Symmetry: C5
Subunit: 325 residues, 5 copies
């Protein structure tokens, strides 16, 4: 005796974390599937068009299958007043049958968005799929490192800005290495450096560049700043690279990362379907919601789960930079 | 012989005071209830999701009940020309049956907004619920200090910017204390310092920071300034904290407060229902309005009341800073 | 044989002079009445709400009546081609029956707006109602000084910026005097100084403040500048007061005025009805328009009139400052 | 056998040249007439309203008639595929019956806009109506100088910025002369100086003002710049006058003009009707278009013409300034 | 047994590369035709209007025909789940029948946009039509140089900014040469210099102009920057010319180009129809899409092709500048 209420999940769309705002994981490179196994094709080849004749026809991608981790947050009790989920029809919406549903959906979306932000930051920073048990111990049968998955390796770096010299030389060399790795595409938009607030301050005021960054600060001139105005982050552009001060808190100090934006199919995502006998071999809606009124004779629960995974197919283009303060 | 006209309250929505613009008390963390007693749950725990299996289930909040203070401003006399509250139907709206109603509603909303701003500023500054009699004497049976309510304590500070040194060190230490208090969440957006105009000027031009704040003033670069453009306040960002010059007038001189923005469920609010035999155990519309035409044989009155309360559940994260000029 | 065409007055709304843009006289504090006598209530008291009980009830304004000056500009002749005022119906609008009406209405609105701007500037500057005969001689039976009307007095000042010292000290003292006059309200938004271009230049570049105003000019940072972008005025903020360079031309040189913005009911206005046997004891539409086709056998006229008045109820808060160059 | 297609002219409205963007010749002071002779009334008098009584009534413009020059650009051949001007009905619009019509209309509008910009620049600069034959020789029977038309004279000037001193003194004196000429109106908005790029550079960097214009350049602070953002011109404000660098190309070097903006009825325009037996004593649509399919047995032509004229009624307020580099 | 699905191409419009954003190749100067041969008319003459009489009538363009290169990217296999191209009707859209189609269309549009950007950059930089075989060898029977096509020649330049002097003198001389080439039109908007990032940095910080470009950087003041805010490029204006730092990657280092914007008919484009027996002598939709379900008994393919060409009719106005670092 379970009734589905997944459609109401759209009544309050999630927010957009800093990575989503930067466009690293957007709604474009994210597809909904109908199986627990998700296909990701890392197409690194040429699809160039060329001139042909009026007749004569004329016109090999490594893809991998993984298991999408399951994460239910079904912990929820219906208060028998929040049983106003019998919406639409004729309803009594006003505020009584609208605001309660909106608040419940907003709470669920906040929890799901926190989980998804954790997944995305794990994919970008640790270069692996997030999958952990209740105790906080990684499930090695689901946490698959991308480098060891695609048969590829990632770049590194080592900079200490306290002593002397301009650190941006290493960043430029990494830029040349990355663009050589892209080769026949070279389709990056900008070079961003996700750095902590302390690292940003340390690298922004050292005497080699302490004048240009402070005296000649081009406020509201950077493309990211103009495209932002929804977050209070601080940016600085120099030597063809941009320093971005992440303020989410998940960026551990002493570890800044530099990577390009705009490379197609570099970052992907998926929304596997929910575990059920009715939702098997059926397309997924992303975040689910079921109202169970037969699990317990005393209270009815609101079961909610989300299946989601991320990877960096072109993981070779990420510079796992290390800073020292 | 009383007819209700609460629905017309929406014809002129209230303004948004500085606290509402900053997002401290917004329409999100504010719910309408159907009883004089309001429930507030200070959930400070972990609701993290984790990986599970295809089967096996897998998935303690202190809440307190208070009395919502009642505040009627029913003082109002119908002029027998402002008896045009027989709107809609066919009406004669034009200006005669529209502008009078709009002006009356705007006046009532202005009074209610002043009262609500007083409530919110009392909750933030004095860390207690505002409840006073006609003489201006606190009703101790309703004014419940939040610290002594949740079994929690608040932080303090002591800075004199007239002599020397950079005051922001104390602010940074308080920031670390607050983020340690949040612990496993650390989900603050920015560190704002509600300071008076005199305190702002004193702390902005002392010679330790007199150059950066004046010469290197990043006008229209702060997130608050970009998100504002509806108030003429002045802001300054330094050392990872923002100085905000409140211009509402309710911020007494010599007492600036520093607190974080964005912490979920830290600030809440409620709208208890109106005292009546028809509005008991019925959801509330916020601000009410009744037209009484039998109270006095001579004149008819316009009774209006609003029930409203605020608290700071995570009161431990507020730094009750003290400044000296 | 007269047909009314007052409704077409809305086809081209008036502009907004500098005072209207600043919000001194807006559409909020302006009401339409149905008599030649207008009521203005200077409520300077407390309407504060307070806590009460579930039962027990719980909950003197000087208002004055004046005569609204009448001002007809009925001088107008119908060209017998501008007799296309038989609009709507089926019409022939295209451009023939639309642009002629629009141009006539725009001309009438321009004249009325000039008159109304004169009324508003007289109310603010000379602190009296504008009422003059054809020769330009004041009608003392209608020109009622606000100070001698409300039983109140206004403030003054005296500053010469040519010699030395910072003039803003006098402005600050006047600010304290005004806020003391408001007392239990203190609800001003900003301190604006309506000053002429010559006075603005004289007070902006004297050596005491010649550096901050020029070198440290916070362009596009003032609230008025951000809220403007529809006028080319120049502003400067210092010592908690703003210097505004009026460019309307009605501000005589050597006389700058400082007054607060946002004080409720300080500035009011009214639109008395037109003088007629059909428009007596009838609500007013503001600006009227009648087509008279029986006044003269040769030509038909377009009679237009507007009744309008302004006052400063809280006149005690205006600083009639005097400058010397 | 001619069918009219004037209505399709609105499918692609013209652009707005620099003069139109500045508001010198806008859609407000431009009326459509029904005769080859156009009436322009230079009303320089007082229409001020004044107080009157409840009864007693209470309440000479030089206008000139000119011939509107005719300018046909009927040179056009229908390709028998651009015979898709049988639009609407049921059509086949898609792209075939839409884009061809749009391109033809855009071409015609571009030619007409070039002609109209020439007319407007001739009216402003040479202070005469543009009317020339095919050879480029002025038709003295239509080119009527405005000064010799209204019985008025225009101002002049003489400045050489290469040597020394501040040129703006002459501009200020001309400003006082102009405002004295306006007298009882004085309703100008700003003092603009249409100057060439070379003249702008010469007058902007001479050592008397080389510091303020370069070091203290108030970028995006001028009213014109904020109201622009559709043209890449450069502006500078000083001494109550604005220097505007025209980039249209029709401003000959060594001749900059200073004139006020906002003066009512100073600049006017007209759209006389097309020369035909069906369009005589009929209101005009501005730019016409006729499809003639009987003029030539071989090809059908697309006849298009526009009648248009401009004048400066208050020509006495224009300073025909002369610069020397 | 082939069904056409060209209409769905509009479900996801292409992006706009840097050249399209600058307006070099926009949707205005781009027409859809119905033959493999495209007509381009380089009209460099006078179409000026002039005054005429009420009667008397009053009122030679080199055009060339080329073959539009054909470029199919028909390489595509239907997954038998992406056979949801039976959209509309009643459908099951939700996400299943919407997102798959949207993703396929977005992929096809991305490939086509890359091809079209290559065509446009070849037309602008190499001044020839792009046409190459699979091996990447130019088809000389389709690659027609514009100079040798129109009987015209292009300009050149030679600047080395490393040594001394101001390079902008050569740019100014080229500007005068170009405007002399335009002659009786002179209708350019701005002088842009498409330069690489390295060339931009080299030419922006050399000591002759190292101060104005850095100290006096007019951020957000250039017209291109205001009209942009969709790309993170950097611009600088000096001596009446603008330096633009292209970041697309197709601009080879050591070769910057200066050319004017706004010249009518200088840049054109075309969309020839698809090669088929049903799409011959039929207007073109730009990018096509056909679903072939009889080509192979095993899998069905998604055939897609685009015919497209560009030229610079007024090629004489482009300065093929050469830089040296």
């Amino acid at each position: 005796g379970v009734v589905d209420y997944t459609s109401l999940m759209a009544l309050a769309p999630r927010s957009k974390n800093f990575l989503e705002l930067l466009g690293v994981f957007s709604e474009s490179n994210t597809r909904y599937i109908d199986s627990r196994y998700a296909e990701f094709e890392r197409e690194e080849k040429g699809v160039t068009k060329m001139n042909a004749m009026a007749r004569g026809g004329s016109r090999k991608a490594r893809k991998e299958i993984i298991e999408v981790p399951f994460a239910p947050l079904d912990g929820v009790t219906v208060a028998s007043e929040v049983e106003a989920f019998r919406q639409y029809g004729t309803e009594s919406q006003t505020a009584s049958v609208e605001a309660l549903v909106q608040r419940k959906i907003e709470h669920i979306q906040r929890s799901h968005g926190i989980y998804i932000r954790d997944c995305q930051y794990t994919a970008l920073l640790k270069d692996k799929i997030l999958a952990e048990d209740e105790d906080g111990n990684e499930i090695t049968a689901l946490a698959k490192n991308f480098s060891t998955l695609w048969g590829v390796s990632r770049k590194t770096g080592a900079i200490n800005t306290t002593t002397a010299v301009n650190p941006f030389s290493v960043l430029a060399t990494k830029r040349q290495e990355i663009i050589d790795s892209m080769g026949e595409n070279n389709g990056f938009t900008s070079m961003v450096v996700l750095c902590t607030t302390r690292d940003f301050n340390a690298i922004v005021d050292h005497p080699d560049v302490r004048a240009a960054y402070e005296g000649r600060d081009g406020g509201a001139e950077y493309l990211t700043r103009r495209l932002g105005d929804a977050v209070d982050f601080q940016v600085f552009t120099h030597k063809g690279v941009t320093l971005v001060e992440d303020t989410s808190g998940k960026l551990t100090d002493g570890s800044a990362y530099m990577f390009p934006l705009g490379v197609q199919d570099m970052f992907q995502a998926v929304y596997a379907p929910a575990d059920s006998t009715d939702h098997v071999n059926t397309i997924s809606q992303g975040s689910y919601l079921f109202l169970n009124a037969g699990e317990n004779w005393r209270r009815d629960v609101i079961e909610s789960e989300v299946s989601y995974a991320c990877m960096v197919t072109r993981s070779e283009l990420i510079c796992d930079l290390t800073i020292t303060v």
